[PDB]
C-alpha cells in the first residue's frame, strides 16, 4: 500500500509539500501508539511513502 510515484509525478510542487507534511504528521501520530503496542505495520508504508515523495521532488 501507500502512494504511487506515477501518480505523484503529475502533481505540483505545493501539493507534494502538503502531502509530505501530512505524512509526517501521520508518522508522528503512529509513533505514540508504537510505545504502547509493540507491533504496528502501517508505519512501514507511510515511512516509505515519505521517501517516494522526496525522490519525486528531487527528480
Amino acid at each position: 500500500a501507500g502512494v504511487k510515484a506515477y501518480e505523484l509525478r503529475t502533481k505540483s510542487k505545493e501539493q507534494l509539500a502538503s502531502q509530505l507534511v501530512d505524512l509526517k504528521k501521520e508518522l508522528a501520530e503512529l509513533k505514540v501508539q508504537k510505545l504502547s503496542r509493540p507491533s504496528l505495520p502501517k508505519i512501514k508504508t507511510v515511512r516509505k511513502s515519505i521517501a517516494c515523495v522526496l525522490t519525486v521532488i528531487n527528480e
Binding site: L30, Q33, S36, R37, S39, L40, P41, K42, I43, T45
Partner: peptide, 8 residues
C-alpha cells in the same frame, strides 16, 4: 481498539 496502525 484505539490503534490505527495495526491494519490498513
Amino acid at each position: 481498539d484505539s490503534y490505527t496502525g495495526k491494519s490498513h
